[PDB]
Amino acid sequence: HHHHHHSHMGKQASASYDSEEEEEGLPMSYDEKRQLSLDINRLPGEKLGRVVHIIQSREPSLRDSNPDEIEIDFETLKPTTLRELERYVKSCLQKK
Numbered sequence: 001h002h003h004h005h006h007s008h009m010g011k012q013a014s015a016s017y018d019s020e021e022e023e024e025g026l027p028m029s030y031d032e033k034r035q036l037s038l039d040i041n042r043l044p045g046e047k048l049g050r051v052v053h054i055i056q057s058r059e060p061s062l063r064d065s066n067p068d069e070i071e072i073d074f075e076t077l078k079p080t081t082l083r084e085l086e087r088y089v090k091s092c093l094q095k096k
Helices: 030-042 045-058 081-092
Strands: none
Touching (some): 030 045, 045 081
């Protein structure tokens, strides 16, 4: 708590986009899956529990289960769920 005056404005819209979601349900490479394990490992405890909340939305058979009990294996979930995780982490730690 030293120096309280710092002016700030952000105004210049150069080129933005607005795309759809899609599933893109492709069995991705091992490198993609361990990259998710790595990015998610950097994320908050919330955002770790959130990757589980995603597989729980996909699998009602896991939705009622404790997210603390199980970890997120990217091969056992749907070909779409690993892809939904792929984009989610890159929406969370960086912005798109």
